Paper text:
The severe acute respiratory syndrome associated coronavirus 2 (SARS-CoV-2) and SARS-CoV-1 accessory protein Orf3a colocalizes with markers of the plasma membrane, endocytic pathway, and Golgi apparatus.
We first evaluated the oligomeric state of SARS-CoV-2 Orf3a2x-STREP in cell membranes by chemical crosslinking and concluded that it likely assembles as a 64 kDa dimer. The overall architecture of SARS-CoV-2 Orf3a is a dimer and is comprised of six transmembrane (TM) helices, three provided by each subunit, with dimensions of 50 Å in diameter and 70 Å in height. The final approximately one-third of the TM region positioned above the cytosolic domain contains a ~12 Å diameter aqueous vestibule which is accessible from the cytosol through two narrow portals. Although the portal could permit the movement of partially hydrated cations (1.5 Å radius), the composition of residues lining the aqueous vestibule is highly basic (K61, K75, H78, R122, R126) creating a positively-charged region that would not be suitable for cations. Within the SARS-CoV-2 Orf3a transmembrane region are two distinct lateral fenestrations that expose the aqueous vestibule to the lipid bilayer formed between the structured loop of TM1 and TM3 (Lipid Site 1) and between TM2 and TM3 (Lipid Site 2). The presence of density in both Lipid Sites 1 and 2 in the MSP1D1-containing SARS-CoV-2 Orf3a cryo-EM maps likely represents two lipid bound states that are averaged together during the 3D reconstruction.
Residue numbers in the entry:
A (entry chain B), B (entry chain A): 40 to 173, 181 to 238
Write the structure that this text describes.
C-alpha cells in the first residue's frame, strides 16, 4: 500500500537537480548561493529517495542484504549533517555569510567596527598576501570582497576546529612595487 | 520484462556514493583525485539510474508528462559532458593534471624546460602574488605546489575559452619584507 510513481518522480527530480548542480559556474556571488540552494534541494531529494526506497524494502521484506547498506547511508548522511552544523558554527565564528557560499577549507577573517571581512583560503601558509585596490577590493587568490574599512594588524585563519593568527610585517605601496593603484600587505603566522 | 531490483540497487548505490562524496575533505592532493573518482562513479550511477527509469516508463507507457523532463535531464547531462571535454582541453593546454583535480575557474600556469606549474585561481585580478619558499613551494591563495625550477617573467591565466597574460614587475626578497625564508613575486596583467 505504498505508491511507486512517487518514488519514480522523486528519483527523476533528484536527477534533474543533481545534473543542474554540475552546470552552475562559481564566479559571481549570487550564483554561488544558487548553486548551494540547488545542492540543498538535491541533498534533500536524495534523502527522500533513499528513505522512500527503504520503505519499499519494508514492503518487500528484503532487509537482509540491505540493512548494512542503508545503515551506512544514514551514518554518512548524519556525518554530513554534523558537517553542516560545523559549517554554521564556523559561519557564526566568522560572523559573515561567506563560509556557507564558499567551499574553502580555511577562511581569512578580520573584524572592523563597521564591517567584517572573510575571504576563502585553501591551506595554512607561513605567509599571506592581501592585495587591495583594483573601487578598492581585498582579494586573496582571486577571491575578492568589497572594501569598506582599513586593514587590521592581526587577522585570523579560521577552520572547523583550529584557528591560526597572522600578524602584519610589511605593507607594499605602489611606489615600491611599481604596480599602479595596488597595495600589498604581508602577514606571517605567529607562534606562542 | 524489465527487472526492478536492479533499479533499487542502482539508486541505493547512487545514494551511497553521493553521500560519501560530501564527506571527503579537499586538503591533500590524492584525496582530491579520490573525491573526483567518487564523483565520477556517482555521475555514472546517476545516468544509469535515470536511463533505467526512462526504460521503466517505456514499460509503463507514461511518456506524456515525462518526455520533457527526461529531455531536460539528457540535455543537462550532455552539457556536463561538454564541460568535461572542455576541462580535458584546458588540461591539455595547461599540460598538467591539476585542472582535473581542482575546481577553480582559472589556472595560473607557466612552463619550464624540466617542469610545468599550474596553480588554481579564482578570478582574473589586476595583479598576482606568487609566494615561494616555506622545501621551497609555490603557493597562491593557499594552493601549493612543489618547486623544481625558477619562476618565469611571463605567466598565463588559462580558462575554458580565454587566456590572460601576466608579467613580472617586482620581486620581494626576505630583507625587504622581513619574512624569513619567503620570497614574493609580483605580476600584473598586460594590455595589447
Amino acid at each position: 500500500s505504498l505508491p511507486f510513481g512517487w518514488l519514480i518522480v522523486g528519483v527523476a527530480l533528484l536527477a534533474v537537480f543533481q545534473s543542474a548542480s554540475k552546470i552552475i559556474t562559481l564566479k559571481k556571488r549570487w550564483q554561488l548561493a544558487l548553486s548551494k540552494g540547488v545542492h540543498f534541494v538535491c541533498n534533500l531529494l536524495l534523502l527522500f529517495v533513499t528513505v522512500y526506497s527503504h520503505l519499499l524494502l519494508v514492503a518487500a521484506g528484503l532487509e537482509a542484504p540491505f540493512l548494512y547498506l542503508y545503515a551506512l547511508v544514514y551514518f554518512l548522511q548524519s556525518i554530513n549533517f554534523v558537517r553542516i552544523i560545523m559549517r554554521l558554527w564556523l559561519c557564526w565564528k566568522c560572523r559573515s555569510k561567506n563560509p556557507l557560499l564558499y567551499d574553502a577549507n580555511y577562511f581569512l577573517c578580520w573584524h572592523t567596527n563597521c564591517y567584517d571581512y572573510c575571504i576563502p583560503y585553501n591551506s595554512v601558509t607561513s605567509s599571506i598576501v592581501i592585495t587591495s585596490g583594483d573601487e578598492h577590493d581585498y582579494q586573496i587568490g582571486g577571491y575578492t570582497e568589497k572594501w569598506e574599512s582599513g586593514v587590521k594588524d592581526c587577522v585570523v585563519l579560521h577552520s572547523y576546529f583550529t584557528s591560526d593568527y597572522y600578524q602584519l610585517y610589511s605593507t607594499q605601496l605602489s611606489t615600491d612595487t611599481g604596480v599602479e593603484h595596488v597595495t600589498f600587505f604581508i602577514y606571517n603566522k605567529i607562534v606562542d
